[PDB]
Subunit: 291 residues, 4 copies
């Protein structure tokens, strides 16, 4: 498949022991495709609480998400881990399930050299033979990739693109110009309109689980040149994003899904549950925007 | 004169002793208006090497720049200084010359509280009675202004707007929505197109001294919805900006102006002159983009 | 046991598949106690490449290290993980082996609230019933703990102390004064002398695997008031530390151990092996300091 | 006069219009020497609100402070400015008054290259022919100086030392070792004891205006090896520093001086006066430590 389009970063519901609720996960995956009308799922990303999970649980999430959607739906599997053996194990498993591409966060925590980071990507690709999307998230990792470093990664024919999240539209424009044939998917929901006019091929986001229909309008209207209409929809989307961030984003998004009849469970500790102090303000937002 | 529009941040040529060359300053001012077709000048900003000047030289720059241009040209006087007495003296001086508004950088160096910063603006206004534009440049000052802080400043009727430079389009969008009737001029030339679609009322920029005609097209095309054409001109403009940044932006911009026959002098020490190692690369840029 | 003293942060040797070499691990543990004359081991810390390992491998490292040392040797088990279920599983396993205390890195990657971080610690303690040492490493995690936050943690009778690494001797002094009866172990080998005079109870370090005898002299001489002698030994130790950092610290420390006849193996990918370009310079250092 | 020793960073009292109160400035200078028993004054530093003053006021402060004290008192004149012409004028002026050395903050605000910073120092020296002390204060300037950069500066015979404030005792130790014959004066009052054991030749500090007698004991006791006693006085001194920092350090220090009957005036706007909400807490501190 052409991997352009809009993707939900799949949220995962848990029980009080931090185990995956598979029936709720199935519902969330179906919500993103059937109700939010998205093109695909980005599975076991940050938004899925992936870095709090064990290896068997990550496989559970990949299996369930793949079983919950039709064959037209695009699937990207985030397999990055500080344990390269585990990234490779996950990448094979996701590839064999039929995921269209793998993705991996830049190695973090330790002050890896860029050559070490480069060869992490190359090693995953060698072992899996699948296409790879760089997951660049300096806000969480503290790792920043320069254009020269992007050029060295993109020189590999199987590094087909990037999930781009640095709040830097100068660097985004330089990448877009230097690599016209690579895939760039923006990961900053609150700046989708600016990404869109900067030539991104689509976007991956946690908030698209609840606001995917407005997001598709932002994208489509901006590309049409109906720029005032698209920005108004960005203003509305940012009211939502700002609100859910103030309340704790992943649990609050899951509370929005619960309101729709989904068995949305709990976050995985050490994330705490949605605080009920925020309930009235969340209710007003859901009403105001028909969420 | 409502102050929407495109402004050159006026560059200043010095002699070997760091004194102002009034003739070249006049030629730079005229170039911005006549040749680059800009709406106005932002005078004694960062780009004017203002923070390296003495008081008498800052007054000199204000007088020369205003004498150089006709009465239809919009003029904003940057008068911020760590010396509040100096800021007020300069503010009265520029106000008496007939500058259309004042602007002031946030106090920097010392860890001032927000109340101290707020009351610096309020004291400048009380003493000058001119309208005031906040100059927000965290990349240089390390001072960041939150939405709640902007709300407090903008609650003052004579704080009419902001020269906004933080590389944050979420904050920009929140400001635009919260203050639909304040003036927002963006100060990041390399992200003019994203600023424009985010609803800015114009822009102030050092590179507009050499590339103001493309900048006008970006701003006009984007607001008309010809977003792909506007973005292509951003790509071209970003080749120029990236190149001059790599060579030393203020001296390199003055060297491009010297190519047009302007007496562009030298930077003020401790800035060094343009390094002739860059000459070949500069000539290729000038030829490629007809600068 | 009283947990005061000097500890090696245990290094782990791997094969090319990233599996633990148990015979080499045994040798490294014996090196730290018998040759370097240290008081204990800090097991599965950052220096042991812990965050690159799977759960079964972490258990392997705990088992082997415990089997390699006598009953007088103090053992601290680092069990922090982003997976709380795994931290608890490891904490029980290490407790049942007889480790004297558990330790856990502050949760990282996600922007956890402090209440979330607090209850991660409290949850581990509830499940394991062992004493707990906070592992504060802002250089790697980006998480900073304030004195007020330290006070809330130390209010728990089973949080007995901290492995302190923030490069902040004002905060260290405030903690030392506010909590005279808690255990403070410094983790910055290059500032051991300053830690010692700031009243730390001991120190944990990767470089003590090769330089533990000088480190004990720094500590003992500084406490005696032989401050010039202790600082001279810090100058010598910092030549070593600076050198090994420039070459890649964990592999280079392991190459020093290899020189002693230890089966020191390889780092775990994505860490690369020691580069042989550095061999001559490493040889000169080993000679100069008898390592 | 070799310039080792303990210096007050001289505080300046202003009237309501931000003009210097020469009588109170004299009383502050005399207090530092007579009552606090210090070796010298560091004049027109950050603590003197120097960066808020005009040129004529900076000269005024130099003249008043030197007239206030006897010829045995060591005097260092801070003359750094973003205006290099001003720095040279002030340097010549202080040199003619008989100041024992000059000092200068690293140029800040603009992103100057290291060559530009290096040649600012060299140009001040060439024009003044006085000895020069680097004022390194990254907390305020955002400029950090590496060991290799220090090597280049110290290769100049008239750069005799540094006022060192970076919170980095590894760098301090490397500098002390590499340059055994340069003057290193530390500028972090709250870490005087750690500086002293790291081999500094003295210290410059704003809190020594009120607590110089304890500071002398810390410095002397630590160099004698009575490290526990020196550290207890650091604990006491840090109660004072933490308290004044929380209240607004320069106005709060002047308020402590007003308690001794000194005409301590006001801070220069945009600094606000001491907030009387803090009065009770300040009085308790003054009583507890006999300030």
């Amino acid at each position: 498949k052409d991997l352009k389009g809009l993707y939900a970063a799949l949220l995962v519901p848990f029980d009080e022991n931090g185990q995956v609720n598979e029936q709720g996960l199935k519902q969330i995956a179906q919500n993103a495709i059937e109700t939010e009308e998205l093109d695909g799922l980005y599975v076991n990303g940050s938004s899925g609480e992936n870095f709090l999970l064990n290896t068997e649980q990550k496989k559970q999430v990949f299996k369930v998400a793949k079983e919950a959607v039709g064959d037209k739906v695009k699937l990207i599997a985030q397999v990055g881990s500080l344990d390269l053996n585990e990234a490779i194990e996950l990448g094979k498993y996701a590839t064999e399930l039929g995921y269209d591409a793998l993705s991996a966060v830049t190695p973090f925590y330790y002050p890896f050299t860029f050559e070490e980071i480069r060869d992490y990507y190359f090693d995953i690709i060698e072992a899996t033979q699948n296409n790879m999307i760089i997951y660049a998230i300096p806000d969480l990792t503290g790792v920043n990739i320069s254009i020269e470093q992007f050029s060295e990664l993109f020189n590999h024919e199987k590094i087909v693109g990037v999930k781009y999240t640095a709040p830097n539209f100068f660097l985004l424009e330089r990448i877009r110009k230097a690599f016209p044939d690579k895939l760039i998917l923006s990961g900053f929901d609150e700046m989708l309109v600016q990404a869109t006019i900067s030539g991104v091929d689509g976007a991956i986001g946690s908030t698209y689980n609840v606001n995917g229909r407005r997001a598709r309008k932002i994208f489509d209207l901006a590309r049409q040149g109906q720029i005032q209409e698209a920005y108004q929809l960005q203003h509305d989307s940012n009211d939502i994003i700002e609100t859910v961030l103030s309340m704790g984003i992943y649990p609050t998004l899951k509370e929005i899904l619960r309101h729709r009849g989904i068995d949305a469970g709990l976050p995985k500790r050490p994330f705490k549950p949605f605080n009920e102090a925020h309930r009235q303000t969340l209710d007003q937002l859901i009403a105001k925007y028909d969420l």
